[PDB]
Amino acid sequence: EWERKEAERIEQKLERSEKEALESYKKDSVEISKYSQTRNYFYDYQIEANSREKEYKELRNAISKNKIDKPMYVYYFESPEKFAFNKVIRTENQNEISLEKFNEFKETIQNKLFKQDGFKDISLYEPGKGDEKPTPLLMHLKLPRNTGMLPYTVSTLIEQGYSIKIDKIVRIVIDGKHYIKAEASVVSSLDFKDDVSKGDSWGKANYNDWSNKLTPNELADVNDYMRGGYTAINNYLISNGPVNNPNPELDSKITNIENALKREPIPTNLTVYRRSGPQEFGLTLTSPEYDFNKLENIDAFKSKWEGQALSYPNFISTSIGSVNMSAFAKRKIVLRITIPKGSPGAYLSAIPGEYEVLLNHGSKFKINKIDSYKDGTITKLIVDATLIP
């Protein structure tokens, strides 16, 4: 009975606007949690206009009012699809999980990072007979120190917003039913999501002096790229020009830009966002395979790319923010890239001349997970990828 009273006490910690958001969450948690997962991929004014945005902000703040002084382990059920295992571990009318499935799931999640986002109800205890157990996959996640956790009436609300790795899997039994329990932990990353102004503040802070660290040749070539020279340079790289139609002048610009990007490496794990056209994924601009309003096109896309490596011949322009922009209005693919500390890269928008981080030509990305979301009536994809050192 002490948990129910303790939750009551926790709500009294909150400001009244935050209490108001929690009460709305108590009545309906499904639509707000769904919203909290993909809210940051819309335009900034589209976010501001959303009927659920005030509730999201207040609930986010509410959670931050109750931070743990030490790492804490939480339990919650998850769909294997969340980890790019697009088939059942077992059916829900089954008790057993085959050891082949166990090894297959292990092979899938092995040595990969997976982005987790949005509101989630957790438990501090292992689930038993009475509790709802909707899937065969039970997450046991180590939350890093200073993470908010909101007990309410009893369940507990958290907001995910981090890369996770599954270190170990174990087979457990509850009421005769077998589950995969997945031991997971958080790998820290800077992720500004929709807050482009804070992102831009970071970028300027980390790259304000970068220009001064460049040689005159390097500075000239970085300037030329930013001013529109990127089209010639990237078209030349994409068509394999250096081999089949060499341009020694363009090759020299490319070398200089590459060197500039290696001068001041990305100092911390950083998440960036690229709105990708069809060509980067091997589709023509006119491709009927590029339309993700049809489910068959999504299936085909995952089958080609999910769990596979993707190399870019050209330099890769990304944003520190995940927000949609007019320049990328048509594009149906958000490439969400985690950059490991030490990678070549630069915030180009530190030079006067929006929100651009440039990654080195010839970079390879490991596509961990692909998901779809609705932006009005256009289905778009979110490609969760890691830049390979």
Q: How many angstroms separate the CA atoms of 45 and 375, rounded?
A: 14
Backbone angles phi, psi at 339, to 5 degrees: -100, 120
Residue 193, token pair as written in the block: 């999501």
Asked if 177 and 95 count as a contact pair (C-beta separation under 8 A), the reply is: yes
List, as residue ranges, the binding site for NAD(+).
274-275, 279, 314, 331
> Which residues have CB under 8 Å from 118's CB, separation 6+?
33, 34, 35, 36, 37, 38, 159, 160
Domain extent, residue 321, equals: 191-389
Based on the fold, state whether residues 117 and 72 are members of the same structural domain.
yes
Q: How many angstroms separate the CA atoms of 112 and 83, rounded?
A: 9
What is residue 278's three-state secondary structure? coil
Q: How many angstroms separate the CA atoms of 333 and 367, rounded?
A: 13
Backbone angles phi, psi at 296, to 5 degrees: -60, -30
Q: Answer positive or negative: Cα dihedral of 291, 88, 166, 111.
A: negative
Method: X-ray
List, as residue ranges, the binding site for Zn(2+).
96, 178, 361
> Which residues have CB under 8 Å from 75's CB, separation 6+?
122, 123, 124, 125, 126, 127, 138, 139, 140, 141
Residue 246, token pair as written in the block: 């060499």
Based on the fold, state whether residues 205 and 176 are members of the same structural domain.
no
Q: What is the enclosing helix (H) or strand (E) of 11?
A: helix 2-12
Based on the fold, state whether residues 170 and 219 are members of the same structural domain.
no
Of the candidates 369, 88, 79, 323, the residue with the CA atom closest to the CA atom of residue 199: 323
Q: How many angstroms separate the CA atoms of 360 and 344, rounded?
A: 6
Based on the fold, state whether residues 125 and 68 are members of the same structural domain.
yes
Asked if 213 and 264 count as a contact pair (C-beta separation under 8 A), the reply is: yes
Based on the fold, state whether residues 228 and 283 are members of the same structural domain.
yes
Backbone angles phi, psi at 321, to 5 degrees: -115, 155
Domains held by the chain: number: 2
Based on the fold, state whether residues 218 and 186 are members of the same structural domain.
no
Q: How many angstroms separate the CA atoms of 57 and 119, rounded?
A: 12
Asked if 118 and 58 count as a contact pair (C-beta separation under 8 A), the reply is: no
CATH number at residue 126: 3.90.176.10
- The Cβ of residue 263 has, within 10 Å, a number of other Cβ atoms equal to 14
Mind giving me the DSSP string for 195-258?
Answer: -HHHHHHHHHHHHTTHHHHS-HHHHHHHHHIIIIIHHHHHHHHHTTHHHHS--HHHHHHHHHHH
Q: What is the CA radius of gyration of the chain?
A: 23
Residue 272, token pair as written in the block: 């960036």
333-339 vs 378-387, strand pairing mode = parallel
Q: Answer positive or negative: Cα dihedral of 150, 155, 157, 162.
A: positive
Based on the fold, state whether residues 198 and 145 are members of the same structural domain.
no
List, as residue ranges, the binding site for NADPH.
230, 234, 274-275, 279-280, 314, 331
Mark which of 190, 212, 234 sits at the end of a domain: 190
Measured torsion, CA atoms of residues 213, 218, 222, 223, in degrees rounded to the nearest 10: 90
Place of tokens 């911390």: 268
Q: How many angstroms separate the CA atoms of 127 and 88, rounded?
A: 20
The DSSP call for residue 42 is S
List, as residue ranges, the binding site.
96, 178, 230, 234, 274-275, 279-280, 314, 331, 361
Based on the fold, state whether residues 150 and 199 are members of the same structural domain.
no
The DSSP call for residue 81 is G
Based on the fold, state whether residues 325 and 228 are members of the same structural domain.
yes
Residue 234, token pair as written in the block: 């990237």
Q: Answer positive or negative: Cα dihedral of 46, 50, 52, 55.
A: positive
Based on the fold, state whether residues 41 and 173 are members of the same structural domain.
yes
Asked if 113 and 338 count as a contact pair (C-beta separation under 8 A), the reply is: yes
Mark which of 149, 166, 190 sits at the end of a domain: 190
> Which residues have CB under 8 Å from 231's CB, separation 6+?
none
Of the candidates 250, 73, 258, the residue with the CA atom closest to the CA atom of residue 158: 73
Based on the fold, state whether residues 246 and 385 are members of the same structural domain.
yes
Based on the fold, state whether residues 175 and 198 are members of the same structural domain.
no
Q: What is the enclosing helix (H) or strand (E) of 18?
A: helix 16-27
Asked if 329 and 348 count as a contact pair (C-beta separation under 8 A), the reply is: no
Backbone angles phi, psi at 28, to 5 degrees: -150, 110
Mark which of 138, 167, 190 sits at the end of a domain: 190
